[PDB]
Amino acid sequence: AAYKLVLIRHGESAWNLENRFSGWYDADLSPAGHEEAKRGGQALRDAGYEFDICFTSVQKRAIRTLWTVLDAIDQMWLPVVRTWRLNERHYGGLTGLNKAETAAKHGEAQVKIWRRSYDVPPPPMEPDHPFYSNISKDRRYADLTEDQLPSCESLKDTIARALPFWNEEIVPQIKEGKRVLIAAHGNSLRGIVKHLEGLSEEAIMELNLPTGIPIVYELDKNLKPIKPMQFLGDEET
Amino acid sequence: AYKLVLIRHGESAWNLENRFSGWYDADLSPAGHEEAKRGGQALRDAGYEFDICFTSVQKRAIRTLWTVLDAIDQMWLPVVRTWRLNERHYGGLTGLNKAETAAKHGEAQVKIWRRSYDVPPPPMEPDHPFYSNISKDRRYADLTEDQLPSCESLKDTIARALPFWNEEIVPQIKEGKRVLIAAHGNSLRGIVKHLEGLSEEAIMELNLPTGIPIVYELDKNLKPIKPMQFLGD
Ligand SMILES: O=C(O)COc1cc(Cl)ccc1-c1ccc(C(=O)O)c(NS(=O)(=O)c2ccc(-c3ccccc3)cc2)c1
Numbered sequence A: 001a002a003y004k005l006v007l008i009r010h011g012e013s014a015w016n017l018e019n020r021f022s023g024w025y026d027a028d029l030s031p032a033g034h035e036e037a038k039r040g041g042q043a044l045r046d047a048g049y050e051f052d053i054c055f056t057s058v059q060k061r062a063i064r065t066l067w068t069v070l071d072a073i074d075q076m077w078l079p080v081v082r083t084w085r086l087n088e089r090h091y092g093g094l095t096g097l098n099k100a101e102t103a104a105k106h107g108e109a110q111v112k113i114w115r116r117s118y119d120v121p122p123p124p125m126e127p128d129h130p131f132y133s134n135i136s137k138d139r140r141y142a143d144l145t146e147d148q149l150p151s152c153e154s155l156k157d158t159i160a161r162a163l164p165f166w167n168e169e170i171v172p173q174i175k176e177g178k179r180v181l182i183a184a185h186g187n188s189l190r191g192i193v194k195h196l197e198g199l200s201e202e203a204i205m206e207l208n209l210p211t212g213i214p215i216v217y218e219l220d221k222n223l224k225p226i227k228p229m230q231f232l233g234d235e236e237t
Numbered sequence B: 001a002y003k004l005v006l007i008r009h010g011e012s013a014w015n016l017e018n019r020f021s022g023w024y025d026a027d028l029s030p031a032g033h034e035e036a037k038r039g040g041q042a043l044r045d046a047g048y049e050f051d052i053c054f055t056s057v058q059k060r061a062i063r064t065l066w067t068v069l070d071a072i073d074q075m076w077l078p079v080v081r082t083w084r085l086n087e088r089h090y091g092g093l094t095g096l097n098k099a100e101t102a103a104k105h106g107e108a109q110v111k112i113w114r115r116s117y118d119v120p121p122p123p124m125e126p127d128h129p130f131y132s133n134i135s136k137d138r139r140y141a142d143l144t145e146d147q148l149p150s151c152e153s154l155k156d157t158i159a160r161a162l163p164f165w166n167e168e169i170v171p172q173i174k175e176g177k178r179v180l181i182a183a184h185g186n187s188l189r190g191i192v193k194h195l196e197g198l199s200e201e202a203i204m205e206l207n208l209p210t211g212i213p214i215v216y217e218l219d220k221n222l223k224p225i226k227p228m229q230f231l232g233d
């Protein structure tokens, strides 16, 4: 194929352990998620993968996943670009709640609506939210215009602010011949997959990307996948 | 009063900091990683904040930068890596200890190399065990034939570094970005020489400590307004 693209979704965070919604909250990897990242890097290493540029979010679970990979494949000297546009979905008011508090507070029907809807956002994170300032006033977002910093996001929203970065920053790089590695989050990566494969909103809702596993696309010169996405690792995983 | 912070990596594997590690991509030792860790803790306890970091393409410095940024919770910061911040290239001596250098070249020539600002050591030849390792390394495949050193005098190292300073770090400092620089002894020495307008003999005298934030306060023209400062006990 003309081009090769590798994506990796970060692994288990500290907050997955507590069953808490992270979104834009900057949770670090759990030890186990760190190990997933190591296994993924080892898979790239064993397959002799080489990259020229790396993209990731401004969230430390994705950034650390990237570091761990670059270490495994002995390519820590690569340029790395970080952007909020690759951030996890902003879960708004649900940020910091766990599963139980959320089901108790909103009921099964409303939670099903949130999980199954493509353009239904969860409640906005209001200024009295425990993490309002921790997130909304983090200087790493100082450069965002008033309307780019979200209070909550549907999947459509997350994909809408991620795809501009794909089209304007990564695509040019792929067409330049640069081998690209994107280390990010399930939902912004969902956006990229939906675009690459022209999936329906229904299909993309069905799709969950495996964590800590390198996801290889062989693409033609128009960035059209020449075959289904493949994973790297041992025969088991 | 602009604030600029420099840090020099610590000990590398297999004693290579005492074997002219140079352009060989030696990793930090556990001890050297701990050194970076303390440097980061000190930067945190003092609440330092940066807006952009520069480093070399050598992993001991890259890992020092990673470790600092971890400790200070600023892993989201933009990072620029450039071979111009690379350690001095010690040519054929790369990998040799003091004794082996003396055996192979003589005390007289070794002392001259120590004290000389513009005398390079012998080139690293194709029979050197690191020759293809370094010179055929993908990370340098964008350098011109005249850019990829086979050896370097201190002058060569500083000459190759200062263009990156001028063309890339200074503009960030002027726009007010708080710059952090993680690199190596001799590339940091070039920067210090340019800051403090030092002499050849002076910079060859200067010996920057490792694992310890070095702090400058600059003015609208980027001249230091006090001696450098060190963060710790
Ligand atoms: O895209 C994503 O990020 C993931 O999807 C979501 C998106 C948003 Cl914004 C918010 C939440 C989810 C989400 C969150 C939690 C769960 C979960 O495990 O609790 C889940 N799974 S569920 O099948 O739909 C489900 C099934 C049964 C109940 C139930 C409630 C009350 C009593 C008894 C049962 C609740 C939820 C989905």
Ligand SMILES: [Cl-]
Pocket: A080, B079
């Ligand atoms: Cl980085």
